[PDB]
Amino acid sequence: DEVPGMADETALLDWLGTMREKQPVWQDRYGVWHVFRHADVQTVLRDTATFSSDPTRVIEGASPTPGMIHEIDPPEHRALRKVVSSAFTPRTISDLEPRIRDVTRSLLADAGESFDLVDVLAFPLPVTIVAELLGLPPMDHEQFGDWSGALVDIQMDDPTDPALAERIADVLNPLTAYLKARCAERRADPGDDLISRLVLAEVDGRALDDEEAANFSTALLLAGHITTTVLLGNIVRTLDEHPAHWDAAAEDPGRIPAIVEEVLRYRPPFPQMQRTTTKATEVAGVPIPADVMVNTWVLSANRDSDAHDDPDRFDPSRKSGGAAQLSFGHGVHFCLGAPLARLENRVALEEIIARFGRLTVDRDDERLRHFEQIVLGTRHLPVLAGSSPRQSA
């Protein structure tokens, strides 16, 4: 009666595989309901009326934290997402390419034969880009990175460690008050930055006060950093295992986006999502009571043969793309950061190939560490360049 941890990936995948076949809806000893098949995960994620993103919904006198889009249900979710989206736009994201490329190239250019891909690229990159998108003083970047980094590091710890909430609040409370001051500053004296945009936005009579704007910016950072960090490490780890794709991608960089989707399917940085039932309901004929937590295994869905032929084959030739990418969610909460996630990882892989041709994982480098809670991937990924401009080759 145990959920296998995130680190031993094979044992995890083996267990999910058995669940999809023998117990596709399972109630754990904590009374959390686990959903393993793709069809059923999809059903849960579409049905927001039954499967709420708002645990406060089911509690007398409790209400959601304002600005926290991922914690609220339609109709208000729609109202808010519309406001937020008007600030954080497709051109906003796409104009970021040169800076992403510029930061990435510079960081890699200082990495030679041996290095940790996460320490060098995957960890610092996303947070640099979030800081710049938000428009915050270059002189605030170091502390901003330290707060985000601390919160990434928190996830290395056992999530049932009862000190969890306190250590989270120790970082979160200053972060958000820094952003909320920035919001108030920007409301009085706006610029060309996401915070300014967020405090300037109004869509259908609806705007964000400083509280909402600050909570959103914080959520945006938290959603954006670890996931993106984990994705790039997973990309390199997966090419390591299927290395003929290094050369295919080297030859044709147009192949990179399909590689990024296939890694996302193969190794979702978030293997699980959570909902709360609002009422007695059923999944796949299995009865689930009101007011309980349901965990949808995206990782199990991604490896479901009923949804993906030869699911355990790493195969970028799959006809992937768009809103079908379960690793960014499904339905109204579908990842707001998806274009940025996709952009950052496409540029990152392009740049890795450009400089190195190929990376191999140093699997016996003892600094290698996997996460084991919310995330499927690697905190430190020692690598070895196939080659680099540093060699008199």
- Bind-site residues for substrate: 70-71, 274
Using CB under 6 A as the binding rule, whether residue 337 contacts ligand HEM is answered as yes
Residue 310 φ/ψ region, left for φ over 0, alpha for ψ in the -120 to 50 degree band, beta for the rest: left
Q: Does 276 bind ligand HEM (CB under 6 A)?
A: no
Choose between 70 and 242: whose C-beta lies nearer to ligand HEM: 70
Quote the least distance from Cβ 131 to ligand HEM, whole Å: 12
Residues 29-68: x/- map of binding to ligand HEM (CB under 6 A)? ------------------------x---------------
Q: How far is the CB of 48 from ligand HEM (least distance, A)?
A: 10
Question: How many residues bind ligand HEM, per CB under 6 A?
Answer: 23
Residue whose CB is nearest to ligand HEM in the complex, by number: 337
The Cα 9–Cα 224 span in angstroms is 23
The single residue among 12, 69, 235, 352 that binds ligand HEM, judged by CB under 6 A, is 69
Site map (CB under 6 A) of ligand HEM, residues 201-230, x = contact: ------------------xx--xx--xx--
Cβ proximity to ligand HEM, 349 vs 385, nearer residue: 349
Interface residue with ligand HEM among 52, 278, 327, 378 (CB under 6 A) is: 327
234 binding ligand HEM? (CB under 6 A): no
Return binding residues for heme. 77, 81, 275, 333, 335
Question: How far apart are CB 237 and ligand HEM at their closest, in Å?
Answer: 14
Please choose, out of 110-118, 301-309, 323-331, 381-389, the segment that lies near ligand HEM by the rule CB under 6 A. 323-331
Among 20, 37, 182, 333, binds ligand HEM (CB under 6 A): 333
| 272 in contact with ligand HEM (CB under 6 A) | no
Chain breaks of the chain after residues with C–N above 2.5 Å? none
256, 273, 283, 375: residue in contact with ligand HEM (rule CB under 6 A): 273
Are 100 and 92 within 8 A, CB to CB? no
Q: What is the distance between the alpha carbons of residues 89 and 234, in angstroms, rounded to a whole number? A: 27
Judged by CB under 6 A, does residue 238 bind ligand HEM? no
Q: Which is nearer to ligand HEM, 95 or 161 (CB)?
A: 95
The β-bridge relationship of strands 293-296 and 33-35 is parallel
By the rule CB under 6 A, 347 interacts with ligand HEM = no
Question: Is residue 124 at the binding interface for ligand HEM, with CB under 6 A as the rule?
Answer: no
Residues making contact with ligand HEM (CB under 6 A): 53, 69-70, 81, 219-220, 223-224, 227-228, 231, 269-270, 273, 327-329, 333, 335-337, 340-341
